[PDB]
Design a protein around this ligand. Structure first.
Ligand SMILES: CC(C)CCC[C@@H](C)[C@H]1CC[C@H]2[C@@H]3CC=C4C[C@@H](O)CC[C@]4(C)[C@H]3CC[C@]12C
Ligand SMILES: CC(C)CCC[C@@H](C)[C@H]1CC[C@H]2[C@@H]3CC=C4C[C@@H](O)CC[C@]4(C)[C@H]3CC[C@]12C
Ligand SMILES: CC(C)CCC[C@@H](C)[C@H]1CC[C@H]2[C@@H]3CC=C4C[C@@H](O)CC[C@]4(C)[C@H]3CC[C@]12C
Ligand SMILES: CC(C)CCC[C@@H](C)[C@H]1CC[C@H]2[C@@H]3CC=C4C[C@@H](O)CC[C@]4(C)[C@H]3CC[C@]12C
Ligand SMILES: CC(C)CCC[C@@H](C)[C@H]1CC[C@H]2[C@@H]3CC=C4C[C@@H](O)CC[C@]4(C)[C@H]3CC[C@]12C
Ligand SMILES: [Mg+2]
Ligand SMILES: [Mg+2]
Ligand SMILES: [Mg+2]
Lengths: 96, 163, 96, 132, 145, 145, 48, 48
């Protein structure tokens, strides 16, 4: 809200109001006022895009790594490994 | 970073307030971010949203103190100078409310805010009270009714100062 | 009764004049810890008794023991300042 | 290279190696160590007095870093260094192997605190003395 | 010298911590006090020149009315209302709004702000009790040294 | 004989526990009460010989002003101020500081200390409720024996 | 100095021992042991 | 240290160290603003 508000305080904000009204009048009817702005380059845009994708992969990789260090996941993974180990023992016992 | 604009983040309330009160005496001796440099330092310090927020606070605080003084002191038989100053100030406030209504993302976004509703109550109460007094300035009863309406006005103004 | 005796002796020894000293601090702490543990044991065995047969447990709590000049276990527990034993539902049921 | 200062020339080889560790970390972009040394406002010996070639080529010596850390702790930090014990004539002293270890570890410990490497700090803290 | 005691010294430290909550309450209370005081003082004595007595009237009763001492007999006397019912049969109809403004004000101050202060004190106490004990243990050394 | 009841006996035990918090409040309150009382009594009646009435004046109003009963009409009468506004048009300018000292004092006592006591009571209650139940169960045996 | 060094070693040894008795560390160590056990079974199956 | 020998630990805390202009460890801890060290029972026992 205070980015777009004029600087001048309330007794003196009438000067700012008539100045903006004067600019609006010069732009709509006279059209003697030129406006200038800045457009971001494609290089810095592709740099931000590359940065965002790299950080997306890093957060997801970190998130998967963090979720595998949880107690529930480690107990479940340990359980499945012990089940697969028993299956391989059944194969070993068959061979003896 | 957007709040402080092109100024250092270590600036406190009192430093920016003192620099606001003393522009030519506190701004050179502050490092952040010769008509070439002095003009650049003003344009950077006074383009910041924080400085505008501080200017609006101070302005609303004077408005509260001056309007409070106006309601406490007796009304004259004609429209006084302080009444004219407050009239110019509230038309300016009304124009500022119209300016924020036009350039926002709709009437609904404006009316959602509780402070905009408080602003409308402020402008409405002052104009009723002012026209009540201005209808018959020499009438004692009109002055009494006008101060009665303006009693609600001072309460809303101090409530609006909590923003 | 022995668990109550163990709790009382450790609690009295931990604040006794013979245990004050720079080297006995940890020992004192250990005594207090052990006292609580023995108190817990006295509660636990009591609870088991009340679980198996409440009337026989009441008879056990009313039984006069020769080691404390012919008076019952609740009197012993009160004299040993065992708040946990006294606050137990079995003991409270006998008192009611 | 040889230096006219008698204090800098008395320094052993491992102090120059710690200076090399500071230099390698300092040449990296946006390193806080170089900023700390520049904002410290000290001379080659670390004294708060604020030629030029010696002041830049040997800007990361252990004595100067010790002075910076000394102002960082409190108003009365003063580590007493004795590099004379690393000579071969003190080999017959019984406890010297511990002292040489302790001093060396301490200096490396301070370097590891400066770069904020906790694991290396804890290991050098464990080998040396005055743990608390 | 209360700081030596294991009961009073930590409570002293908590008091200094609760001073910020007291200051927060003062800043919130200042809004209602000044607003109600200017409004009420203007309604009770209109057509009067500003003086130091006007400022004392703005500050005096509003502050002491949040502690339960209501100046309603005194406000009734100042309002020049002669009826058996208090704020009736007055010379001006505007002064009859004084009990209403007051009705909002003590609702704002006692019902809302004081109870909010109780909530801030309870929350603040639970947050900084262990820190107060730690701070007392540091001040134990400070007093000893 | 309330101790037999499952509701009143534990509450009795909690009351005895809260007496320490009450004592802590009394020790903190004593500082402000004696300080404000000596200061206020000296400002209200200067150039007077010390007597028992001076001591009663130090103790009487300060203690009862923390319960909301403000002696402002009585203090206004003792100050010999004849104005319509209360602490104005006085014989001595020093006695006009009485409402200010009082303004600090009840801020110290009601706003700060009473709310702190509420926080100590809530914390103390949550800490020792189970211990109070255990103590009631021991006192059940004591009364039975 | 000797007392302080001995107690430094004792606290660090006790700290390592305490950290190995934690639930997370024991589950992780148990998991790595079961993984190493499967690798050794692969070797056993190769031998059969 | 306090677990092994409290008196020797007290002697250690009272020992003046050359690295801080001949004053003890509690002074060092206070100067380092270590609230946790100062709030410890061993340090408090030495202070009492
Ligand atoms: C929007 C909110 C906050 C304001 C409420 C409206 C206020 C300003 C209006 C609404 C009704 C009004 C009152 C209506 C009638 C009378 C009787 C007259 O003999 C004196 C004025 C008096 C007492 C008015 C004072 C101002 C008043 C109270
Ligand atoms: C938000 C709250 C804390 C505001 C604080 C209120 C203070 C500033 C007010 C409340 C009551 C006031 C006092 C009331 C009466 C008098 C007597 C007068 O002859 C001199 C001023 C004096 C002594 C006032 C000084 C200011 C005062 C103490
Ligand atoms: C705060 C807002 C939202 C609430 C609005 C309520 C207000 C406007 C109401 C409530 C009580 C009302 C007063 C009640 C009685 C009288 C007496 C009458 O002979 C004149 C009007 C007058 C003096 C009223 C004025 C308006 C009043 C103050
Ligand atoms: C549940 C609670 C909040 C109910 C609210 C009570 C309100 C509605 C009551 C309480 C006290 C009342 C006031 C008491 C006295 C007067 C003076 C009289 O001449 C006009 C009405 C007026 C101004 C009353 C208006 C209504 C009032 C403000
Ligand atoms: C506690 C400290 C920090 C606050 C300082 C405020 C004190 C000093 C102020 C606040 C209100 C003041 C009083 C307000 C009014 C008067 C009347 C005037 O004719 C003489 C001075 C006298 C009696 C003032 C003396 C100073 C005073 C008591
Ligand atoms: Mg607005
Ligand atoms: Mg070591
Ligand atoms: Mg009351």
């Amino acid at each position: 809200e205070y980015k777009d508000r004029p600087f001048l305080p309330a007794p003196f904000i009438l000067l700012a109001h008539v100045h903006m009204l004067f600019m609006r009048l010069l732009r709509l009817c006279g059209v003697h006022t030129q406006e200038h702005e800045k457009i971001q380059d494609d290089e810095t845009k592709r740099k931000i895009t590359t940065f965002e994708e790299l950080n997306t992969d890093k957060f997801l990789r970190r998130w998967e790594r963090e979720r595998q260090e949880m107690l529930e996941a480690r107990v479940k993974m340990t359980n499945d490994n012990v089940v697969q180990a028993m299956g391989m023992m059944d194969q070993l016992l068959e061979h003896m | 970073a957007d709040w402080y604009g092109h100024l250092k983040s270590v600036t406190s309330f009192w430093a920016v307030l003192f620099a606001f009160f003393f522009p030519f005496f506190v701004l050179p001796f502050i490092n952040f971010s010769g008509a070439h440099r002095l003009r650049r330092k003003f344009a950077k310090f006074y383009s910041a949203p924080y400085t505008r927020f501080i200017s609006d606070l101070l302005s609303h605080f004077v408005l509260c103190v001056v309007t409070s003084y106006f309601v406490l002191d007796k009304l004259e038989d004609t429209i006084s100078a302080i009444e004219w100053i407050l009239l110019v100030w509230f038309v300016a406030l009304l124009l500022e409310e119209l300016r924020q209504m036009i350039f926002c993302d709709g009437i609904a976004e404006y009316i959602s805010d509780t402070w905009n509703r408080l602003d409308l109550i402020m402008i409405t109460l002052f104009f009723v009270g002012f026209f009540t007094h201005a209808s018959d300035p020499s009438n004692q009863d009109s002055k009494v009714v006008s101060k009665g309406i303006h009693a609600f006005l001072v309460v809303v103004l101090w409530l609006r100062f909590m923003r | 009764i022995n668990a109550l005796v163990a709790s009382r002796i450790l609690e009295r020894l931990s604040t006794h004049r013979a245990l004050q000293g720079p080297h006995l601090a940890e020992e004192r702490a250990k005594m207090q810890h052990n006292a609580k543990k023995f108190e817990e044991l006295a509660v636990g065995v009591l609870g088991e008794c009340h679980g198996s047969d409440s009337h026989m447990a009441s008879e056990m709590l009313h039984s006069k023991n020769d080691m404390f000049n012919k008076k019952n276990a609740i009197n012993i527990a009160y004299d040993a300042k065992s708040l946990a034993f006294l606050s137990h539902p079995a003991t409270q049921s006998v008192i009611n | 290279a040889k230096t006219n200062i008698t204090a800098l020339d008395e320094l052993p080889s491992f102090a120059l190696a710690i200076e090399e560790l500071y230099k390698r970390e300092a040449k990296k972009p946006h390193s806080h160590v170089q900023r700390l040394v520049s904002l410290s406002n000290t001379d080659v010996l670390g004294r708060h007095y604020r030629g030029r070639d010696l002041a830049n080529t040997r800007a990361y010596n252990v004595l100067r870093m010790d002075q910076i850390f000394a102002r960082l702790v409190s108003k009365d930090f003063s580590v007493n260094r004795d590099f004379t014990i690393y000579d071969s004539k003190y080999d017959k002293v019984p406890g010297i192997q511990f002292r040489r270890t302790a001093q060396a570890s301490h200096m490396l410990f301070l370097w590891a605190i400066c770069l904020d490497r906790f694991r290396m700090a804890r290991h050098f803290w464990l080998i040396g003395d005055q743990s608390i | 010298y209360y700081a030596l005691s294991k009961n009073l010294g930590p409570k002293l430290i908590m008091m200094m911590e609760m001073m910020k909550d007291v200051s927060t309450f003062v800043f919130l209370l200042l809004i209602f006090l000044i607003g109600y005081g200017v409004a009420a003082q203007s309604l009770l004595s209109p057509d009067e020149d500003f003086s130091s007595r006007t400022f004392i009237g703005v500050l005096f009763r509003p502050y002491f009315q949040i502690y339960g001492e209501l100046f309603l007999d005194d406000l009734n006397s100042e309002a020049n209302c002669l009826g058996d019912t208090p704020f009736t049969e007055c010379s001006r109809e505007t002064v009859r709004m004084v009990p209403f403004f007051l009705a909002v004000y003590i609702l704002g101050s006692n019902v809302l702000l004081v109870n909010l202060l109780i909530a801030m004190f309870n929350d603040t106490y639970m947050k900084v009790q262990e820190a107060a004990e730690d701070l007392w243990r540091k001040q134990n050394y400070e007093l000893c040294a």
